[PDB]
Design a protein around this ligand. Structure first.
Ligand code: 0X0
Lengths: 227, 12
């Protein structure tokens, strides 16, 4: 049941890096304290996405064995997993890091900004769906690492090296599932199942981003999202 | 080099 010393080192690295930085309270505070129409919704989206890129690059760099991959493979995993890792981090903030009742207010403001709801409703539905699994901080951080270290990506040259990197993380997650949800043997499969919904967001991310454009993304965001 | 490469390769 218990994590061995090697598994503890992997988990310490992931947990320390995941919780090192926090999304500034003032970015989320602008939504309720300042005018929030389509234009402000677009600008705040850009600031938040920029924060995700800054956090996830730092996190990805501290992933056990990530630096055993060549620079081109490192970039491919970063770009390949970006959308999925962003939604997982947003889901954790939305579900567990906001003041009581603020998640409903932030949802209200986005739904009333003017931006098309085509991709907004499935995003909030995803947050609600993962929110019912009552995930721990460990589970969110490990799922994020597992998403990044996916050997399935369109672009990855050394798939077997990535598979070997992801394997011990899946093992840690399986152990954590057994320790905290012993009554539910399918908990591990349920967690992983929620990643298929993220893959669809990733697959259609260019159309989704298009739907959020107000009459323009920053250079860093254009690079990570291929837009 | 790209912005992503500059950030990824920046020594920790
Ligand atoms: C179209 O409006 C938005 C669309 C997505 C997001 N975001 C998600 C989100 O869940 N934000 C919440 C906070 C608490 C983390 C609140 C504001 C709902 S986001 O973090 O800016 C984001 C997530 C994923 C991608 C691929 C891009 C951008 C933020 C938006 O408004 C600023």
């Amino acid at each position: 049941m218990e994590l061995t010393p090697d598994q503890q080192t992997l988990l310490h690295f992931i947990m320390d890096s995941y919780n090192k930085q926090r999304m500034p309270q003032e970015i989320t505070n602008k939504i309720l304290k300042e005018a929030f129409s389509a234009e402000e919704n677009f600008l705040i989206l850009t600031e938040m996405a920029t924060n995700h890129v800054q956090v996830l690059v730092e996190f990805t760099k501290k992933l056990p064995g990530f630096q055993t991959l060549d620079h081109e493979d490192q970039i491919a995993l970063l770009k390949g997993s970006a959308v999925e890792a962003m939604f997982l981090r947003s889901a954790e903030i939305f579900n567990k890091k906001l003041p009581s009742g603020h998640s409903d207010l932030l949802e209200a403001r986005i739904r009333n900004s003017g931006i098309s709801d085509e991709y907004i409703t499935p995003m909030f539905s995803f947050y609600k769906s993962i929110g019912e699994l009552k995930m721990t901080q460990e589970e969110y951080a490990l799922l994020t690492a597992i998403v990044i270290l996916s050997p399935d990506r369109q672009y990855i040259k050394d798939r077997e090296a990535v598979e070997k990197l992801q394997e011990p993380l899946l093992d840690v997650l399986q152990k954590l599932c057994k320790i905290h949800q012993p009554e539910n043997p399918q908990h591990f499969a349920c967690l992983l199942g929620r990643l298929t919904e993220l893959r669809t967001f990733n697959h259609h991310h260019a159309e989704m981003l298009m739907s959020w454009r107000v009459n323009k993304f920053t250079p860093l965001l254009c690079e990570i999202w291929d837009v | 080099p790209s912005l992503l490469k500059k950030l990824l390769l920046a020594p920790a």
